[PDB]
Design a protein around this ligand. Structure first.
Ligand SMILES: Nc1ncnc2c1ncn2[C@@H]1O[C@H](COP(=O)(O)OP(=O)(O)O)[C@@H](O)[C@H]1O
Ligand SMILES: [Mg+2]
Lengths: 182, 319, 228, 228, 228
DNA sequence: TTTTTATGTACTCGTAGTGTCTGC
DNA sequence: GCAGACACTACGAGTACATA
């Protein structure tokens, strides 16, 4: 047993002093801090006139433009970078948007799950597009039992299909959501 | 008087300092190292500076040599997970019959996908830190996970105060003098070495190398001075002709860069961003980015590049 | 001090307990399990000249298996481990004492709160099916007067309430009933059944062996039903 | 023109040195690693009748392990390598010799600065202990008047200070003191008794292993210190 | 219905052709490739009771690889497939028969335009040589009376110019000249003996492999030529 | 005061399953 | 007469990159 009144080394020492590496793996995970990442704060520097100095930060014209796509006052420069900003340097992209966005004071933010599984499930079945799939459901909600076609498609709801739309934790409350359809 | 590694031939490492007192650091940092060596045991230290060649790996080795430590030097890129659990633990748990402090230098540790090995190192520092210590030398400090900086003593290199910079450059001007004394290089003009140290400062590896490249004559006459002060070019002729609105030279420089259009347009945007006024920064990236957008659509690429030159000359308010 | 095959086999077995059992001068060997949940002790044929710490015993014996059996193992001139062979000389590094955990004291066996036994050739046949039919935690209890062993797969049985394999071994002369529930990940015996000696106190409760070669101890489990 | 299984066994060894090989007609074969690290030469029992360069010698023999040993090899009119079997035939493409880094002429090894003589089982034990002690670089030097080999763990040893092995080999009748370092990765010779020839002049150096049919020139390490 | 070892291995083979399979009452199982290039059929010893369609045949066999051989595969009272073990019980969701592309049309092979037989070790050597020689297409023609299989590198060799392997399979009797090219990719038969049946007339054709248990009908590449 | 969208490509690392070789 | 253990491959993960 435990030698009672001896000093117990920390769990790192316990795992490390044992060639049991699965516990050492648990020891390293204790410092993961992946929830404590960074992400942007360059947009805030764009509309605040702050020394961003991106270089190593993850720059995405896809994203950085689409964030200013919500604010219509920043849209003239976003419309330009959409036009001619293709093939323009990342460092140049932030530098153009520096003197291009008006004032700063970074602001707020920027179609549901149980519908979007049916829409994407009808789309793959009949090999149609989103637009066509969306209309299919809307007409099927009105007519010859959409509940019937839900059962026709209970077999091809794989976890690869599911997790592809909303990973998080829903694709398990959605996996066995459309289970009860018989 | 300078430590030489008489098997090196490469200058930039033949005269790599051996001790802290041979290193050129800011006075507080240099004092903080001499005190860390005086206290016997090395703490967990992260030496970092984004500008390379400031003294990181030298000081890391100088601390191990001053203390006379059983140093395990490792290339941080080969410091994978099976390494931290492998030869790292085997060394940390070795018997220190010698009494010298076991210290592991992980050179160039900041890396992309070494995350699992990086957190393992943190958890490793709760077990075997009783025995050994770890010196980290990195360029990007962020490439290092936050738990390590939380534990390690982070000493930022290459960020000196003004008074610290002045004394450091003066020390370096004396170093390159003692290099030229020991290598066989004649210092005909002392303003060469001063401009050598000053032009490329914080990188001490690069300025020693530049002395090697300018030692091709064996003497540092004022001609070599005119070389070091010659601010080179890249595309200095186009920037010059754009500020002067010289339509003749823009007309003759467009066939010069129509060959490598995509590089030149990118290099031109980089250079004008510094030389042009802020209200012109808007029109600059719009004129260039549009010209590059239609690159290849334009039938004559040379004339299209002259079009960029004329468009910039008329629209750029210069500094 | 050459090590024989009996010593190396017990050392190999003691390696399954601690990652690197440090040994002391004499002929007594002991290994507290990394944390403090299993113990082993044994006397063996070969004399120990020096008390050293070992780091990775399994590789150390693996290095020993490359030289002759009568390789004179000495303590190296620099304080490590010299394995003198015919032409070669392997220098196995000595370990730091603070980097491995050994028994601070060879654990005194308390007065047995209960005494029993297993068999003679059932251990080999007992642990064979025990590992085969995926059962973790094992129990020891009195039934029909006799004390028997019968565990449950705590995986598909987090609440301990099943049955898998019984073993009748002998009757229990005592007049009190209990049930201890040792974790499987703690037992690892050499061939040949030994003597099983039980013990229990308030919020403690070990359980150990006595053997022709070694004595093996295990741990308590808080939620164990004690009668003593 | 069939290849005996000892000749191919020697060929699969040469493939460790260089991923390809350029072999001309005759009984003599050779190869050198691209990084000028190792060089092997050997005369063998079979006879090659035609010059051929093989871009992937490893895959060639791995495919040649799929036809019967009586397979008749030849230069097909399909200008490659014809592997005639009892029923099947393999047309392995001959490669442009310019794409195979090979010694254009056999390396005439200079007069040895020091001569010793490793035994096959001594070499065998040296490889077994290296895989157990993570021995990556070894040094052959003088110890109390005898030529010995000492392995280290350059990863943990760095400066190469802590000795981890000592295969006492022959005796040294000269007066010179040398410390030749070889990288274990460049020990691409197959097991077998070898007469070890050492040479080093200034900042140069190489080691040669004379075999009962196969010779090997392995390169010394940057830190090799000698007084020749 | 009980699934034995030989039948699950067949289903493990039929899974490679189609990600799932549709099987109706009887002992005849059949699947076709989604694009329609490889058709496989098999009469088996295990008899299945109901009609079922499995979309994830690969995952179905993986989940079955935990239940004992007594595995009771039954239909659920609602419709799914429950797997009864000696102890545990699993529930697998069945899929609609139109989700799995079924062959549905087991029209018999016509008259064999050419007939030979390939051994088990001959198919073995073809698949093992191609693994080492990167052979992606094989063509079955006649050479000097006996018919052979030639393997090429369609990517490294546009119009199948240079052979890389040739396997003879007996002699041809009639006075016909042809060259049926089969893609090695869409050739998914399991190891064993196969009486090779070759049918082709005009611009259509196919290759049928008659195994001792199952049949594989693959398609011939368009480049194939014949004078039938 | 916010936190994500598609396709295709190339590389590294870790681990885990599979393959070829060897014992006092 | 096979196991062991190194040796090899495949794959999930994570990463960085260039496009529209
Ligand atoms: N603070 C310094 N003092 C003197 N020499 C230096 C200093 N920093 C760099 N050097 C020169 O650069 C080389 C060492 O570069 P180092 O600082 O170790 O690389 P890094 O800084 O990229 O880790 C040495 O040869 C030395 O001559
Ligand atoms: Mg460095």
């Amino acid at each position: 047993s435990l030698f009672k009144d001896d000093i117990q080394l920390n769990e790192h020492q316990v795992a490390w002093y044992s060639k049991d590496w699965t516990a050492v793996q648990s020891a390293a995970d204790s410092f993961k801090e992946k929830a404590e990442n960074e992400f942007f704060e360059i947009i805030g520097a764009i509309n605040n006139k702050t020394k961003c100095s991106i270089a190593q930060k993850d720059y995405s014209k896809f994203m950085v433009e689409n964030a200013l796509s919500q604010f219509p006052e920043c849209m003239p420069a976003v419309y330009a970078m959409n036009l001619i900003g293709s093939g323009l340097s990342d460092e140049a992209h932030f530098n153009y948007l520096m003197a291009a966005v008006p004032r700063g004071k970074r602001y707020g933010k920027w179609e549901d799950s149980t519908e979007v599984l049916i829409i994407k499930l009808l789309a793959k079945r009949y090999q149609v597009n989103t637009n066509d799939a969306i209309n299919y459901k809307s007409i099927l909600t009105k007519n010859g039992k959409l509940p019937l076609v839900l059962k026709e498609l209970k077999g091809l709801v794989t976890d690869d299909f599911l997790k592809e739309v909303t990973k998080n934790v829903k694709e398990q409350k959605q996996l066995k959501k459309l289970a009860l359809e018989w | 008087m300078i430590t030489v590694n008489e098997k090196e031939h490469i200058l930039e490492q033949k005269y790599r300092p051996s001790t802290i007192d041979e290193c050129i650091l800011p006075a507080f940092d240099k004092e903080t190292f001499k005190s860390i060596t005086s206290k016997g045991k090395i703490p967990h230290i992260i030496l970092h500076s984004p500008s390379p060649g400031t003294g990181k790996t030298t000081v890391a080795k100088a601390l191990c040599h001053d203390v006379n430590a059983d140093m395990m030097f490792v290339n941080g890129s080969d410091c994978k997970i099976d390494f931290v659990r492998g030869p790292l633990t085997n060394f940390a748990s070795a018997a220190s019959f010698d009494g010298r402090q076991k210290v592991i230098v992980i050179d160039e540790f900041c890396r992309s996908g070494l995350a699992e090995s990086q957190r393992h190192l943190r958890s490793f520092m709760e077990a075997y830190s009783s025995n050994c210590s770890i010196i980290i030398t990195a360029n990007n400090i962020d490439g290092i996970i936050k738990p390590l900086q939380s534990r390690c003593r982070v000493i930022t290199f290459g960020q000196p105060t003004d008074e610290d910079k002045i004394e450091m450059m003066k020390q370096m001007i004396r170093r390159l003098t003692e290099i030229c004394k020991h290598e066989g290089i004649a210092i005909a003009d002392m303003k060469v070495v001063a401009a050598l140290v000053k032009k490329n400062f914080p990188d001490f590896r690069k300025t020693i190398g530049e002395l090697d490249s300018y030692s091709s004559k064996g003497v540092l006459d004022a001609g070599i001075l005119s070389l070091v002060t010659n601010d080179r070019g890249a595309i200095d002729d186009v920037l010059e002709s754009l500020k002067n609105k010289d339509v003749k030279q823009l007309r003759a420089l467009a066939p010069k860069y129509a060959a490598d259009y995509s590089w030149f347009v990118g290099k031109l945007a980089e250079e004008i961003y510094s030389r042009v006024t802020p209200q012109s920064i808007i029109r600059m990236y719009e004129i260039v980015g549009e010209n590059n957008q239609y690159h290849g659509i334009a039938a004559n690429t040379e004339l299209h590049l002259a079009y960029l030159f004329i468009q910039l000359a008329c629209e750029m308010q210069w500094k | 001090m050459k090590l024989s095959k009996d010593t190396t086999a017990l050392l190999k077995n003691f390696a399954t307990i601690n990652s690197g059992i440090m040994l002391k001068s004499g002929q007594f060997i002991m290994t507290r399990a990394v944390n403090g949940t299993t113990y082993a002790e044994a006397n063996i044929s070969d004399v120990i000249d020096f008390d050293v710490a070992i780091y990775d015993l399994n590789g150390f014996l693996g290095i020993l298996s490359l030289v002759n059996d009568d390789a004179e193992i000495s303590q190296s001139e620099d304080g490590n481990i010299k394995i003198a062979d015919a032409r070669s000389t392997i220098f196995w590094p000595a370990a730091d004492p603070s980097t491995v955990v050994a028994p601070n004291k060879p654990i005194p066996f308390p007065v047995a709160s209960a005494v029993t036994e297993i068999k003679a050739e059932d251990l080999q046949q007992l642990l064979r099916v025990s590992r085969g039919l995926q059962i973790d935690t094992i129990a020891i209890t009195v039934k029909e007067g006799k004390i028997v062993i019968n565990g449950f797969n705590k995986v598909e049985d987090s609440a301990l309430t099943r049955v898998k394999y019984s073993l009748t071994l002998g009757d229990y002369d005592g007049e009190n009933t209990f049930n201890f529930i040792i974790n499987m990940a703690n037992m690892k015996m050499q061939p040949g059944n030994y003597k099983l000696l039980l013990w229990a106190k308030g919020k403690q409760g070990a359980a150990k062996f006595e053997g022709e070669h070694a004595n093996y101890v295990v741990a308590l489990e808080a939620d164990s039903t004690h009668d003593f």
